[PDB]
Amino acid sequence: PPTLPFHGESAYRTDYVPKPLPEVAKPVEVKLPPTLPFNAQSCYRSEY
Amino acid sequence: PDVVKRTQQGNYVPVRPDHFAGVSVALFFAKAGHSKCAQIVPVVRQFYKTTNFSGEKAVIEIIYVSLDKDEQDFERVRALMPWCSVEYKSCLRKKLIERYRVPNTAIPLLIVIGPNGEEAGRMNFQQFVLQRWDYRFNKWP
């Protein structure tokens, strides 16, 4: 009589094979605006 | 290198590697003579034609790694497949089918891969599953 090969694998083996690592390099920056120059004025030093 | 042919009817020129430049990639293990393979081949051709070229970017692409028992089997199915395929005169045939372990039952089996030689999903055609590709993670960046 003939014999068959072993065709059957474990449920952990068939699914839990390793998985591709995600793309974890997406850095972003901010847009902090510059400060407008000082043009405010004191009333004493503007009048007197 | 000198492996995986594209589509090119008449001369069958292979593929320089950056054809796969942002497409979802899978391995479609199949073999003619297997009756279950026979009705999955035209419907995966249908998936290869509406979610691929009906609109924008070619977003899917598959490789036919053959498990054919003779060479005359190979050119009949590969002339039928408009997607890419590996040849019989190649060491890439056996190393893929034993890394993913289709016994030589399994046919047909689709396994999406990544840019690592690493699986990203098991399909289980053999017994309507085609619309679960998730071709947004499957990208080969």
Residue of B nearest to A15 (CA): B122
Report DSSP state, residue A34.
P
Whether the CB-CB separation of B58 and B23 falls below 8 Å is answered with yes
d(C-alpha B38, C-alpha B20), whole Å: 27
Contact B34, B125 (CB under 8 A): no
CA distance B53 to A43: 72
Report how far apart, in Å, the C-alpha atoms of B96 and of each of A24, A48, B60, B92, B115 are.
Answer: 28, 90, 20, 6, 14
CA–CA gap between residue B30 and residue B80 (Å, rounded): 13
Closest CA to B5 of B75, B108, B58: B75
Show the tokens assigned to B114.
Answer: 């990544």
Alpha-carbon gap, residue B8 to B25, rounded angstroms: 19
- For β-strands B109-113 and B119-122, DSSP reports them as antiparallel
Backbone angles phi, psi at B78, to 5 degrees: -75, -30
Peptide bond into B108 cis (omega under 30): yes
Angstrom resolution of this structure: 3.5
A17 at the B interface (CB within 8 A)? yes
Alpha-carbon gap: A20 to the closest alpha carbon of chain B (Å): 6
> CA–CA separation, B141 vs B131, rounded Å?
22
Asked if B116 has any chain A CB less than 8 Å from its own CB, the reply is yes
Best probe of the A interface among B25, B102, B119, B138, by most A CBs < 10 A, is B119
Determination technique for this entry: cryo-EM
Residue of A nearest to B113 (CA): A20
Backbone Cα Rg of chain A = 36
The rounded Cα A10 to chain-centroid distance in angstroms is 36
Residues from chain A that touch B118, judged by Cβ atoms under 8 A, are: 18-20
Distance CA B111, CA B128 (A): 16
3-state secondary structure B50-112: HCCCCCCCCCEEEEECECCCCHHHHHHHHCCCCCEECCCCCCHHHHHHHHCCCCCCCCCEEEE
Inter-chain residue contact B141 with A19, CB threshold 8 Å: no
